[PDB]
Amino acid sequence: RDHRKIGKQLDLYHMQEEAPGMVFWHNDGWTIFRELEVFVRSKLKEYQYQEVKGPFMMDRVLWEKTGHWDNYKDAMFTTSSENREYCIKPMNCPGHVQIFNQGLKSYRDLPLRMAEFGSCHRNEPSGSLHGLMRVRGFTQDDAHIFCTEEQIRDEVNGCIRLVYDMYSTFGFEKIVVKLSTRPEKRIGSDEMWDRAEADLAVALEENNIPFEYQLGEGAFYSPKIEFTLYDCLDRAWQCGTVALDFSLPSRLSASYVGEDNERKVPVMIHRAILGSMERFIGILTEEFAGFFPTWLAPVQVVIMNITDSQSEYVNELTQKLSNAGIRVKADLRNEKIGFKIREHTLRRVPYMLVCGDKEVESGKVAVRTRRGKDLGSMDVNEVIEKLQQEIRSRSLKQLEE
Amino acid sequence: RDHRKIGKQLDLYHMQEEAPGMVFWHNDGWTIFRELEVFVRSKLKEYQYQEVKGPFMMDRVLWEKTGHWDNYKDAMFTTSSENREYCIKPMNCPGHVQIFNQGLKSYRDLPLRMAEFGSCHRNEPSGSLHGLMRVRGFTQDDAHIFCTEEQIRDEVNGCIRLVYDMYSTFGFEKIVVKLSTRPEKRIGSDEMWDRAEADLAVALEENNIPFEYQLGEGAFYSPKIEFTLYDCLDRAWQCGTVALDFSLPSRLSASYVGEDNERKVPVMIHRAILGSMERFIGILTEEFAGFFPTWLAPVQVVIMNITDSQSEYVNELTQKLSNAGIRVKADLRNEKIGFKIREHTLRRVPYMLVCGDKEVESGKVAVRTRRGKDLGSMDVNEVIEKLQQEIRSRSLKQLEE
Ligand SMILES: [Zn+2]
Ligand SMILES: [Zn+2]
């Protein structure tokens, strides 16, 4: 159940010494990554977010103003051009404040939710790297909510709904929640931390979530709620984070015009459900042991043929299933039919369609799954509808499974 | 008509001094970018390309084995970690070969078409940076085809088909083709250079494409066909690129087992239709002067009420259209109906739905386009149905013109 072993077997990704801690996504692995984007983008529309894209490196003067430079200078990549030093972004927080700062905003623009699939780069030690779990180049499903102080409860409640909503799609139902409090090197007065810590504590209790206090483990700018999910091996994975930041928007001079026509600093809420999506794919690879659900499968259907008589019929089927929105390959190789079926069974292709002379003259197809489950002959349109339902619903279990 | 003024007016993007030549894509601009990605991915499916992803930095040693370091080392960014120098990738070619090298390849795996929306960073002088046309961080629609010598004539013909297929969607019909020959600073044998240059000219003749040679304007490793398009102002924009490479696969130790069971070095084709997608968005911005086709419009439909009586009926339509996959926004401000239409016309929204009490009872809408035309009262399901066809077909023309 090692993702590195399964990743090599299914041709999902690879890593090499020339880029330590950075992933070479192959076609099948990228399909999973992009399909996770589609699911996340589906939730961003449902929860009414904005998707933006910031630049990959910015001037060091920005990271000095946030205080990130004074704290994580060793963990950042630096580069220079025209006697100016730039940092490859390890976080999307300052980049989102820049977008919010363009054009005067009013209180009617809030709550303004801003998400991004930002690719970040942290200079982790090479000895600390392990597969997809600990990488240098990662992509966080970051988002920052700009809202007023009266809107904190409603925004955090929406974030908590999203944390459990997205985890339930993958089957993760056991979740442990912590609450990281102020550390010994922080910014912002005590009374700001007091109100921030109490805000997250109340929202956790109003959501009927039992939580423990991780004292001193919060970020230097905000206290955070940490969600830890458990896989089928009962292993704890810390993925979700929700923070309450009253300081960084002020340090970057973010302002909005309130109802009293007074300049006010907006509240910033950092949140990430999956965390590092590279790491989340590694968790899913081990959680399902390569048996990804149909909607996440790199190759959803393979249509083979027994002889060259059914070569035309398979091509007609591959075209039709593709137009229905199904990731389908056609295997017209010159091999034994038992050799083809085994290859795709090892590739964990959820469904494999076999076309003999009987299938062509009957207008049907024989279906077997990657589990050895044999479904027999089914009408072509019947199969298409069942795959469309299993993909739209993002169901975890297959047909007859 | 300058894309920077139109970009600021439509809230598409912005740039600042802290990131020279690097774009802050706002929400509406990023919607255009992603809609381009969807269109390109639709072409990748039709033309049967793979989509992969590579790391954003790699060891300087890898960039030295290709000669990329020798040619443009002043155009690269460099960063260091644990006494190892890494270069932020300005090209996606080395990353794809590393993916190709992983795993044993035979002749049966060719042609291997591998595409990527790679984020590149070139260290351009700040005096040359202009808007979106000249940037430091750009996203190319790169693709590399690994094929045998016999497959060259078909694979290059496939690229030429793709170039004219994609440009037809945007209405560009005046394409000017050049063939960049070898430069005086180059690598590879003369005999290899003549095979590649002659093959490109033959491929253009087979498609009945008039072209001129361009001496010395080719890459150090391959000759390339350069596609230049003309906008409605008759200005030449060089976007397309198809190169025939005999040099880099040999240098990066890429090989495939042939039919003779003897290892052979594959032929590489570098393909790029749109080029820099930030630059393409800028060209489209000036070509349409902000009147993006409905399939690219950040906000396709705006629904407005004449008074507070129609507030609820407007919201039902906003939800009904949103479920139909249309980018619909509701305008419920307390402003005269003429003021709303004038504002959203300046925002170049394709369609504007006005809802009076006559519309609430009849269940219909009043359609007004950004061109000042009036389409009268139409059934809501009829408006949705025709709007969907205009998007799925990526039609340049709007309704009733
Ligand atoms: Zn953040
Ligand atoms: Zn290339």
Author numbering:
A (entry chain B), B (entry chain A): 242 to 642
Q: What sentences appear in the manuscript?
A:
The natural product Obafluorin (OB) is a potent inhibitor of bacterial threonyl-tRNA synthetase (ThrRS). Our previous work showed that OB covalently binds to ThrRS, forming an ester bond with a tyrosine residue in the catalytic center via the highly strained β-lactone ring, making OB the first covalent aaRS inhibitor with demonstrated crystal structures. The binding of OB induces a large conformational change in ThrRS.
In the apo state EcThrRS_G463S structure, the sidechain of the highly conserved residue Gln484 in the catalytic pocket forms a hydrogen bond with Tyr462, while in the OB-bound structure of the wild type (open state), the conformation of Gln484 is changed to accommodate OB. The distance between Ser463 and the conformation-altered Gln484 is only 1.6 Å. To test the possibility that Ser463 might become resistant to OB by blocking the conformational change of Gln484, we designed a G463S_Q484A mutant to remove the sidechain of Gln484 to avoid potential spatial conflicts. However, in the TSA experiment, OB increased the Tm of EcThrRS_G463S_Q484A by 17.2 °C, 10 °C less than the effect of 36j, suggesting that the EcThrRS_G463S_Q484A mutant, similar to EcThrRS_G463S, could still not be covalently inhibited by OB. The EcThrRS_G463S_Q484A structure is still in an apo state.
